[PDB]
Amino acid sequence: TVLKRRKKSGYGYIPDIADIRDFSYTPEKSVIAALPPKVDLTPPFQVYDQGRIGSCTANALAAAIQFERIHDKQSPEFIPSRLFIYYNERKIEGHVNYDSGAMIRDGIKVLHKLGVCPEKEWPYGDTPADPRTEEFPPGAPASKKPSDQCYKDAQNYKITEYSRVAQDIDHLKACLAVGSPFVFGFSVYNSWVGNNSLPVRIPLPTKNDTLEGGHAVLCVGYDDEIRHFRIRNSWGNNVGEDGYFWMPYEYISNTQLADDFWVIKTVR
Numbered sequence: 303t304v305l306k307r308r309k310k311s312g313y314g315y316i317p318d319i320a321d322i323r324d325f326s327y328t329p330e331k332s333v334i335a336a337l338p339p340k341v342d343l344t345p346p347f348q349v350y351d352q353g354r355i356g357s358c359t360a361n362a363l364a365a366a367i368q369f370e371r372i373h374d375k376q377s378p379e380f381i382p383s384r385l386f387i388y389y390n391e392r393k394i395e396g397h398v399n400y401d402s403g404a405m406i407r408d409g410i411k412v413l414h415k416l417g418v419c420p421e422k423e424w425p426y427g428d429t430p431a432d433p434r435t436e437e438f439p440p441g442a443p444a445s446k447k448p449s450d451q452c453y454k455d456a457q458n459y460k461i462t463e464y465s466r467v468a469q470d471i472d473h474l475k476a477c478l479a480v481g482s483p484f485v486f487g488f489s490v491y492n493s494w495v496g497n498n499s500l501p502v503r504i505p506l507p508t509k510n511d512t513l514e515g516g517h518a519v520l521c522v523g524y525d526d527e528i529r530h531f532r533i534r535n536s537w538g539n540n541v542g543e544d545g546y547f548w549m550p551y552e553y554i555s556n557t558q559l560a561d562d563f564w565v566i567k568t569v570r
């Protein structure tokens with residue numbers, strides 16, 4: 303029998319260990335009472351492509367940081383270094399020499415305590431783990447320690463706070479309604495990704511489908527007209543609608559399908 307290695311290339315989310323100290327995102331009751339039918343925060347910067355490594359948490363969080371800098375009127379615009387996030391996440395949990403994936407909460411810890419440098423200073427390279435050893439080969443950009451200069455510059459971009467959003471459709475909508483995207487993790491089934499069919503609308507999984515892996519994305523909107531949330535994926539702009547997809551309300555609100563909804567902020 304060969305046990306199947308759980309796929310990390312293109313994925314990378316590991317469910318968070320719970321911490322009762324986790325801050326709660328508390329939407330204003332006035333906002334919840336008066337949710338609009340449709341929110342579309344899609345930003346102007348195009349999707350990234352995480353390629354063949356398990357960096358989805360860093361891709362989702364890079365985008366939350368890029369998005370917030372726009373809204374906070376911060377300049378210049380840069381793509382945050384995804385490998386800087388991913389390398390430091392694997393100092394906490396996993397290992398920098400393996401494509402282990404990461405918990406969202408640990409990517410958030412990196413942003414809070416270390417920050418993130420611009421991707422130009424620590425550029426992306428998706429050389430994957432060697433399939434025989436399942437270790438990054440020598441020279442793989444993902445296993446390289448960022449330079450001392452990268453760590454110093456990253457300090458200029460720390461977040462100040464982060465909180466969990468309740469897995470409740472009105473709380474997810476209220477978050478987006480006030481103009482805040484959130485990152486979350488979900489299970490991926492062959493009914494969406496099988497044969498790279500990748501429909502724009504993600505089908506609701508059934509017990510006939512197969513679990514393929516754990517993914518994490520930035521959510522940027524919702525539409526009551528079709529009862530889907532809009533997700534920014536990290537698989538390039540030649541899939542979905544320029545890299546974006548629609549996730550059904552019944553998918554995102556299922557505790558057996560999605561979890562680990564987080565908002566980040568940088569205050570002043």
Ligand SMILES: O=c1ccn([C@@H]2O[C@H](COP(=O)(O)OP(=O)(O)O)[C@@H](O)[C@H]2O)c(=O)[nH]1
Nearest residue numbers: 321322323324325326414462463464465466
């Ligand atoms: O904005 C924040 C700051 C901290 N925490 C929570 O508080 C815990 C400890 O965070 P802190 O930064 O105080 O920990 P330290 O690493 O400095 O001991 C974290 O694990 C989270 O549960 C949080 O949820 N949001």
